[PDB]
Design a protein around this ligand. Structure first.
Ligand code: FE
Ligand code: FE
Ligand code: ZN
Ligand code: ZN
Ligand code: ZN
Ligand code: ZN
Ligand code: ZN
Ligand code: ZN
Lengths: 172, 172, 172, 172, 172, 172
């Protein structure tokens, strides 16, 4: 056992490693979205900027989970980062909806991780999750829902000016 | 065909996708090294800082390659980022030697990519590789070789103060 | 022979003169586009500003080729700058598509010139082209492709607000 | 008819297009002279700087005429820019004398253009010419005559230090 | 083999060592020229300043080639720096012409070195040469050709005021 | 005889030429040492920095001796700069000991030169040597002796951390 390990369950360590992988996967998916929006035939530069920022934030979340794992005496075990479900995100609205789905799944993972930490009476893990991940996930989900709502209202994807003006105004 | 595609061969596109994957893998391996050095039983904070910086630089290299793919009209196809070869890097000297090996493999990949771009008479791809990746890889390999040499001379791994003082002086 | 002439083939000199003429022609075409967009019945001031900037950049590129010709001991031979293929560019989308075509032709000429310089084993000419012209041409082609894509999606030319809003947001 | 056009005769529009071409040609001739003086076997850097400045001024004059054409509702019709009368300008004195001849021909063109605008009772065109082109051409012709006089007195072209010292002193 | 050595041929290493010696020799020749022009019986202070600057630049070029040799894992082997072909450079024009010849020989050496690096498919060596040495050599050769041309026209060496005024104006 | 020559014996001129050559040789040897310490398998960056500084100081000494030669009306005669005694300096301690030996030999040459200048009753040459070279040589020899003493005490070369820590602390 690590000399710093205290009130850290093996299940908590495994769940934290799984969350690390899921946050790295979310970063990779956001990177894919950014790449798609940097294409010449998509050409939505603020969409690409937004999703690159999301990718970097998800990488920061994974690194924070790594720091937590190390601070608690748990051992980080990295896995293959699976490729995103697709490379063609097909629209700004569709990419925003997929980002909403991704952040909802990340939130669900964080929620079951918090449930696990509460089962093991690991108050530091619970506080870490609810302080650094749950509030940020709620904010991200709300922002993505706002983006999806505004894009749907403007008429995206059918309204070709909707995605462009959302790119200029909301994402610029 | 992309409207911007011109003098960009399918083989070059595939090679750049493979290079993007390899740069992402190198970033992941550097992240693993940083995680290992952030452990309480390793506790080399400047080693972890160094390898986190390397991970971020490799991620930036992958992002630049994807920007290149989009600029040339090629389509980025992301793959699974494979798990690093191991999670326990066993020493500062061993981690630096593995980083040397990784950067030499990345350099070899970039070199065969440049060879391919020269075969296809793609001067822009060749210049991009040369100005952004080959010089950087040579600098990284030379720096890692210096690190390995200094750690070996100091007595690492067996000299327990060698890695600590390398951490404080070279990496501080 | 010029006292500075060294490893500079006559064919390289002729190709550089032809590139000078082509870049002067591109400057002239961009000037025509700017003039068209300054018309009262077109009245797209950021389109005119964009194409005037492009004409000035192409003139700078021609002057850089002139400086290269003189630096290598080659003699600059200027030719008639042919008038642009049209004076009425009939839309912002059409002008951007024609600018894309023009920059792709300029890139093709630069690629042929680089191929020639590689055949004559003129490394300085190759480095000059790939350092000052190939990357800039790739960037210009990618930017023009983005412009064309955004204008097409917005609904240009038929969507009369598409060109106006692109003028205001992308080009402003 | 253009919605802004009024008191703008077709002959005035044609004369303005001809002046556009003539000023573009003057810019091209100044470019040729600058190129000649940037040669290694001429090596007169302030002569080249002076004639590049003249080329840019003539380009600005052509663009101002373009702006005038558009402001008046006339349509700019661009023509082939004929190559300069020669590529070897044979001396600093000879290039200065040819620049004098060129600016005097440009002024003569502007004078017959002003005569035409006066015959057609186009006071705005007359004012435009006289405030932006006639005084500028008189100043340019006087400066070129001063340059020619000083170079002739110094002993150019035969006095090889005359052009060098004029380059350093008058043009530096 | 060096731990950093990768895609670095023995012939490339030998050619780099020869170029190091050639750049040190060029620095030594420029030092000789500076010494000659600092003499009381020639006493051209800006000529001496110019050639001392050239000597220091050639020394910096040799040091950069040394850094390249070490970065690539090649071993620097220094040779005797041969004395300059003569100690009396006989005039400002003669020294400028000899400097032109020296820089053209250095350029030819760099060109055959680039040919060698291209034969061995060493893209990093080719890029290093073309970005740090070929453009600088072309600029130096053009500048020296300009100097020789201006000195020849001014009347050097026979015109004793020519070298003095070139010293004051071009070199001051 | 130079118009400036006065109380400057031919033997003093020859001795100063020999001293210029010896200072250039010392600069070359220091450059070799710096190159050795910039190698990946040596990787002592402050040792390389120190010896590069020493080579630049020795080059300044040679340049100042040549300025002295020219001020006195003597003619500088440059010779081949002999290759350094070896390319592999095999340790920081060994390189510092060889630098001590080199500076002691340079000091002995300067002392012989001062003895010669005293024999010829050349007070300006004696003052020049003792003002710019003897004090500097004594300081350099004392500093090199301190470096050698500290390296021997620390346990260099066998103590592999001795050279590293001397690099970081004394030379950093
Ligand atoms: Fe709007
Ligand atoms: Fe003067
Ligand atoms: Zn997250
Ligand atoms: Zn990389
Ligand atoms: Zn261009
Ligand atoms: Zn004009
Ligand atoms: Zn050089
Ligand atoms: Zn010295």
């Amino acid at each position: 056992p690590s000399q710093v390990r205290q009130n850290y369950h093996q299940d908590a360590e495994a769940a934290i490693n799984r969350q690390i992988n899921l946050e790295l996967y979310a970063s990779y998916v956001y990177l894919s979205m950014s790449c798609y929006f940097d294409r010449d035939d998509v050409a939505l530069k603020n969409f690409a900027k937004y999703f690159l920022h999301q990718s970097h934030e998800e990488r920061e979340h994974a690194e924070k989970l790594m720091k937590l794992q190390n601070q608690r005496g748990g051992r980080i075990f990295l896995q293959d980062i699976k490729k995103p479900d697709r490379d063609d995100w097909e629209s700004g609205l569709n990419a925003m909806e997929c980002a909403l789905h991704l952040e909802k799944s990340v939130n669900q993972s964080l929620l079951e991780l918090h449930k696990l930490a509460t089962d093991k009476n690991d108050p530091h893990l619970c506080d870490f999750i609810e302080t650094y991940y749950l509030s940020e996930q709620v904010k991200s989900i709300k922002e993505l829902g706002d983006h999806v709502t505004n894009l749907r209202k403007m008429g995206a994807p059918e309204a070709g000016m909707a995605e462009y003006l959302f790119d200029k105004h909301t994402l610029g």
